[PDB]
């Protein structure tokens, strides 16, 4: 009962920290507190865990009131919320786990036991308007709400003094290095709206177009020599400065004032109220005549979407839907950018949209829990892929948002959602994205929702603006070339499952173009070479032919080879070290894997069974160790051999991957600080084994455990994958991880035979090796293997994969006669060698076939090895006499048997 006693002790200590230490909270459930006190007294005097669980279940109303004090703390699970509540004086585990309440906010920079600033997930720092005193006796919720109000007012006052600095005439290069991205972004939006309105009061647009052009050039010139977080801020702000340039250029080209008024009404406009006494509600947004309220919530420096006209149309329809308190709905084919449109609309209003990824794993309870949380906070809830739920939970969730929207339209103060009365914030909105064509919105939801079918995004404009931000001098024509090439590839290549030539692939191309500029430069060559590095490995053979043809046709560059002779030499050194032979295709696959692992962390290697995946990545590992002089630590972990509890952990015993990650993170001996650590998942790809580690695959590079631990992953901790099929792999992970495809074996028959012979030798000796290698002549072997390929084999295995037996048996048989090789002639030795090789080829190639086919293959072997060689009879064998070996049959080996009756 030791585990039960430990659990009772932990529960009693946690509940004492939650309720016993703090007063004026025991008046809600006096019976429950009395029962807890009696249980604590019994535990001190001394299975008692069921009663504590029942008490904590009956204390949900007190927990509900505690969550009602600060609803952001509602977002965490019950266990982690109790962990925070129990630590009422340490002020720990609060700042490390608020990314799930505040969305894009990670940690708190607190000094001298007081709040100084806050740190987002992307790394941006916000300094508060004033410090907040932190004391042990102060409860978590009070200072949490104080910090929330403080950061909102700090964002507001940073916006205000950014507006003051910009209206004073100061340059943007001095203010972009001081305050957060949100403040400078909103100040720029307000100033741009005012300036365009002042220019619309007249008929001139050229001089402010030139001013914002010089501003864009100034941001680029500050960008090219800035720090990483400042680079992120400048890129994110350059997105909207290019948008403002586009808007002003469109307004300048208008023939009449009607077109100018139309285009100005279509785009989003930002206004500030200069007379209201309120602070957070002093800035609104006009779009198509409709008004929306800025929330001044912190967002950080996110991935800013490029403002295409269809994005503004989505903004306009979402504003039109929210003007009359209707829900939002987007539907269409996957890849049109619906969820990102909702997120960009939310973060363009300075607020964070809570995203629910709808799936079969998401049950009714958690969905309704998050829904009542977001309707008691006032946040915006976006349901991604809503059509991925079972009928009962679909109906329940549909009724829930139906009554939420019914309360929102009628202006109800409170809502009886989920059979409890809850506050209904008037700023709560619900959006739904759908992927139909494989259902659709239910009738109750469709009576109070606005469905919008957003089209495929303008890939030309998006690619052009991304290239312009990246500094390419020829951006429009190059982006048109890239999108036309991707369209040609999607129209001409085969309809493979893993092929993806959408906007995600194009943005991956443009992201991978960034490390390559230091060795190729801002030009078409960088685009061509990154396009090769990220598109070529995933295609077949004829698909690579088509890729090369349209690459030489569309793009003007012919693909000059780079300087990589040293790495090729190290590769050949590793190949001759391990016995591998370097064909052109094996070298191609090795270089593709090497270039893919230069940038992408998680690699997938896909091909037929025994096509050469392990040899490819092991040869690359050896070559890189020789090239860099850097250590290797390889953990070959089969995915499907170990179960989910054993691979990661069961609620606490650490799983294998979690244990090795903790061991490499701790680094007690310091060996891992100067080594490259590799995990090879040499098994089938499982959704339940990969989707359990999404947070490792993305840019977060953090492993999340069931108990809540967040383990960092080092940059050299490179994951590999080794499967044979991709029919059970999600398209998200395919696009997330690098993908290498083995369309054809990386060997010849003779090369594999030579490697197997060398491995068997390593596992008169030189004369024997020469005789064995010379007897395996290629001219007869190729013909005899083509002949064996036409046979019928049970459990059909490729003849290539059969080679691992044919060599390994044959030499061993010769090894079995290593004591009978100094007492015979050369002709007898050659006959014995030929007979043993014939027997091994028989029982490796045709050994999985019928007796008649085995005899036919015996005849074929005897004809293809010539009549000069010793004929392998159908029942021949080699026996050992008292002095020398001899050739005989199995007829003399048969012992007569006598059996009794019973």
């Amino acid at each position: 009962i030791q585990v039960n006693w430990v659990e009772v002790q932990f529960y009693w200590l946690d509940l004492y920290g939650i309720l016993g230490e703090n007063l004026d909270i025991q008046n809600f459930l006096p019976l429950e507190t009395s029962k807890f006190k009696s249980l604590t007294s019994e535990y001190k005097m001394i299975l008692t865990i069921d009663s504590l669980k029942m008490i904590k279940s009956s204390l949900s109303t007190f927990l509900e009131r505690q969550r009602r004090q600060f609803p952001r703390f509602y977002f965490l699970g019950n266990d982690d919320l109790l962990k925070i509540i129990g630590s009422g004086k340490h002020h720990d585990q609060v700042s490390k786990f608020m990314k799930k309440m505040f969305g894009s906010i990670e940690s708190i920079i607190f000094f001298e036991d007081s709040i100084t600033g806050v740190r987002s997930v992307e790394g941006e720092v916000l300094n508060l308007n004033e410090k907040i005193e932190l004391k042990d006796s102060i409860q978590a919720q009070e200072w949490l709400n104080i910090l929330d109000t403080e950061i909102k007012l700090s964002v507001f006052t940073q916006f205000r003094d950014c507006l003051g600095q910009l209206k004073d005439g100061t340059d943007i290069e001095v203010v972009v290095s001081k305050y957060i991205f949100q403040a400078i972004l909103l100040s720029a939006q307000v100033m741009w709206t005012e300036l365009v309105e002042k220019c619309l009061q007249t008929n001139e647009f050229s001089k402010y177009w030139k001013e914002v052009d010089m501003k864009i050039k100034g941001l680029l010139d500050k960008l090219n020599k800035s720090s990483d977080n400042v680079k992120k801020k400048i890129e994110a702000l350059l997105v909207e400065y290019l948008h403002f340039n586009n808007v002003i250029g469109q307004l300048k080209n208008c023939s009449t004032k009607e077109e100018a008024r139309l285009l100005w009404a279509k785009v989003q406009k930002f206004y500030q109220k200069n007379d209201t006494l309120d602070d957070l509600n002093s800035v609104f947004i006009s779009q198509s005549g409709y008004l929306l309220q800025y929330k001044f919530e912190y967002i950080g420096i996110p991935e800013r979407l490029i403002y295409t006209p269809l994005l503004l149309v989505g903004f306009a329809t979402l504003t039109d839907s929210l003007h009359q308190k209707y829900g939002g709905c987007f539907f269409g084919p996957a890849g049109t950018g619906k969820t990102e449109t909702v997120k960009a609309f939310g973060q363009n209003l300075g607020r964070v949209v809570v995203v629910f990824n709808c799936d079969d794993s998401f049950d009714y309870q958690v969905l309704s829990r998050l829904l009542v949380g977001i309707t008691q906070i006032g946040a915006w809830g976006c349901f991604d892929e809503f059509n991925r739920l079972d009928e009962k939970v679909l109906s329940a969730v549909s009724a829930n948002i139906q009554q939420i929207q019914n309360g929102l339209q009628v202006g109800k103060s409170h809502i009886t959602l989920l059979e409890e009365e809850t506050p209904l914030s008037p700023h709560t909105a619900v959006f739904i994205t759908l992927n139909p064509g494989y259902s659709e919105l239910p009738e109750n939801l469709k009576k109070s929702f606005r469905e919008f079918s957003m089209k495929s995004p303008q890939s030309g404009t998006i690619a052009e603006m991304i290239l312009q931000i990246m500094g390419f001098e020829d951006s429009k024509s190059l982006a048109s070339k890239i999108v036309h090439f991707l369209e040609l590839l999607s129209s001409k290549c085969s309809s493979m499952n893993h092929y993806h030539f959408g906007l995600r692939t194009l943005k991956g191309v443009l992201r991978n173009c960034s490390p390559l500029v230091s060795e190729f430069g801002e030009g078409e060559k960088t685009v061509v070479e990154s396009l090769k590095r990220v598109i070529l490995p995933s295609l077949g053979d004829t698909d690579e032919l088509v890729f090369k043809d349209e690459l030489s046709k569309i793009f003007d560059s012919a693909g000059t080879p780079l300087n990589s002779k040293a790495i090729v030499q190290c590769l050949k050194d590793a190949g001759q070290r391990s016995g591998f032979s370097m064909s052109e295709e094996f070298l191609k696959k090795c270089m593709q894997f090497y270039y893919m692992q230069k940038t992408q962390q998680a690699l997938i290697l896909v091909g037929k069974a025994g096509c050469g995946k392990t040899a490819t990545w092991k040869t690359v590992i050896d070559a890189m160790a020789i090239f860099d002089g850097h250590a290797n630590v390889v953990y070959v972990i089969d995915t499907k051999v170990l179960t989910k509890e054993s691979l990661y952990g069961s609620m606490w015993r650490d799983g294998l991957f979690t244990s090795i990650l903790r061991r490499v993170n701790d680094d007690i001996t310091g060996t891992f600080k100067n080594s490259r650590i590799w995990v090879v998942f040499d098994s089938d790809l499982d959704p339940e084994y990969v989707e359990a580690m999404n947070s490792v695959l993305d840019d977060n590079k953090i492993l999340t455990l069931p108990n809540g631990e967040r383990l960092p992953i080092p940059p050299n901790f490179r994951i590999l994958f080794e499967t044979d099929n991709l029919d059970h792999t999600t398209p998200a992970t395919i696009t997330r991880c690098g993908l290498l495809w083995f369309s054809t074996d990386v060997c010849s028959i003779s090369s594999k035979i030579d490697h197997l012979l060398n491995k068997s030798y390593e596992a008169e000796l030189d004369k024997l090796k020469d005789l064995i290698s010379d007897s395996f002549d290629m001219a007869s072997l190729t013909n005899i293997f083509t002949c064996s390929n036409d046979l019928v084999h049970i459990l059909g295995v490729r003849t290539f994969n059969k080679l691992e037996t044919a060599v390994q048996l044959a030499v061993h048989l010769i090894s079995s006669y290593r004591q009978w090789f100094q007492n015979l002639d050369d002709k007898s030795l050659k006959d014995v060698i030929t007979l043993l090789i014939k027997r091994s080829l028989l029982y490796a190639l045709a050994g999985d076939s019928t007796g008649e086919s085995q005899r036919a293959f015996i005849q074929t072997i005897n004809t293809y090895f010539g009549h000069d060689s010793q004929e392998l009879s159908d029942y021949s064998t080699i026996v050992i006499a008292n002095d020398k070996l001899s050739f005989s049959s199995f007829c003399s080996e048969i012992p007569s048997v006598s059996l009794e009756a019973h």
Partner: protein, 441 residues
């Protein structure tokens, strides 16, 4: 034979399943009303008159033509059968040939030869079957107290039942469904009306289908008490025992465009003069696009549903545009773009249909000096010195003065006559093909 035909009808759609006892009671109705040839003729008439109202218009025509074919096959000779089969073959474009010649046959020849597909399809109904049953005749001459009524979207028979509220002088209690509060309200009112009587209507039971699986299955001769259930023909499948225990009715949409304009204009109670004019133009545009929607292969590419929510959204947008304009310079391009792109064209995924909506908006919301809105009526712009009530009187007068022509599906909706002729050809072809597939088996 008739019951085999009706079973084949019910095999196509879940709403048309017929029970044997229904047919036997229908046969008893023949002797109820007030020699073997007359009994057979009354059998055909009574079966059609009772079981037509549970079928949509296409299946009404298919059923009528199949009963006419069966009766004339038994009664008339072989030459009549060959002639009728040639008419069906040329209607379905399967067999060609002149009839072997009877006024009815030569009138049918005139209908088929002059490409009058609707007249050729309705000739059977006009000639053979005499009595026609509306909603009131179905509800009055039925011993069942529970009625299920189904229809397509963009139409609802509920107001018709409100009309029936004045037919029998009974109060109708309309219950919306979709929420737990509405579910409890519906259960309480059902338990009240099962004792105290009164007509109860349930609006769009479909999204409460699971609750239909829970309550009505456990719930299914009071005075002045009849329960009406309204669902959708295109919705989810209703339970079979619920459908068999309730009398099934199908309600059919109006054939007029001007009636839709008048119906929309009679519900706009207010705003100045320009708001009234914009609401009138919006009612006209909504009626025109909703009339064009029903011609699914030609008027559009798919079957969209522009309900009254789109009208409310567009009216709100026009009110907001007119409110924020003090110079009386209406941005016609702005409202055209927001209506053809965001309000009406938002749900449309195709490009040709979006171009159709854009062209309709450009024709309607052009804001010219005089808007010839159809080939019939031209609307002049409002003057600057008129009251709003005078404007409502003027617009009501100009709606009452105009007359809907017989070719309103072509002139008013701006479609070529060839498209309408091809649509009628496809409709008659599908009717005759279904009837052929019934008759050969």
């Amino acid at each position: 034979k008739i019951f085999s035909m009706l079973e084949k009808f019910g095999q196509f759609h879940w709403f048309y399943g017929i029970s044997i006892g229904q047919f036997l009671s229908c046969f008893k109705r023949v002797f109820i009303k007030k020699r073997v040839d007359e009994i057979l003729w009354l059998l055909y008439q009574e079966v059609y008159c009772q079981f037509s109202t549970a079928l949509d218009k296409k299946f009404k025509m298919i059923m009528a033509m199949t009963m006419f074919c069966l009766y004339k096959f038994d009664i008339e000779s072989e030459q009549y059968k060959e002639a009728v089969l040639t008419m069906i073959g040329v209607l379905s474009e399967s067999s060609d040939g002149v009839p072997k010649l009877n006024d009815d046959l030569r009138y049918l020849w005139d209908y088929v030869t002059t490409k009058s597909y609707i007249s050729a399809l309705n000739w059977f109904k006009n000639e053979f079957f005499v009595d026609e049953w509306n909603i009131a005749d179905v509800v009055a001459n039925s011993e069942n107290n529970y009625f299920t009524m189904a229809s397509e979207r963009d139409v609802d028979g509920t107001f018709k039942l409100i009309e029936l509220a004045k037919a029998s002088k009974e109060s109708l209690k309309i219950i919306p469904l979709g929420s737990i509060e509405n579910l409890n309200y519906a259960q309480e009112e059902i338990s009240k009306s099962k004792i105290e009587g009164g007509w109860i209507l349930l609006q769009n039971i479909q999204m409460s289908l699971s609750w239909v699986k829970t309550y009505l299955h456990k719930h299914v001769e009071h005075e002045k008490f009849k329960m009406f259930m309204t669902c959708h023909l295109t919705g989810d499948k209703l339970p079979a025992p619920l459908l068999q225990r309730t009398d099934r009715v199908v309600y059919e949409d109006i054939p007029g465009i001007l009636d839709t304009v008048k119906d929309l204009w009679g519900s706009q109670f207010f705003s100045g003069v320009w708001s009234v004019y914009c609401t009138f133009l919006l009612s006209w545009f909504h009626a025109l696009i909703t009339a064009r929607t029903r011609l699914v292969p030609h008027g559009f590419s798919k079957k969209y549903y522009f309900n009254d929510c789109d009208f409310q959204f567009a009216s709100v947008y026009l009110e907001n545009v007119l409110a924020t304009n003090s110079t009386n310079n209406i941005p016609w391009a702005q409202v055209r773009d927001h209506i053809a792109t965001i309000v009406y064209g938002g749900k449309i995924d195709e490009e040709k249909d979006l171009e159709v909506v854009a062209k309709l908006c450009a024709h309607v919301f052009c804001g010219s000096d005089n808007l010839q809105i159809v080939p019939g009526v031209r609307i002049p712009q409002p003057l600057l010195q008129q009251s709003e009530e005078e404007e409502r009187a003027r617009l009501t007068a100009i709606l009452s003065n105009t007359i809907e022509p017989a070719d309103s599906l072509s002139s008013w909706l701006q479609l070529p006559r060839e498209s309408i002729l091809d649509y009628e050809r496809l409709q008659a072809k599908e009717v005759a093909s279904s009837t052929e597939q019934l008759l050969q088996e």
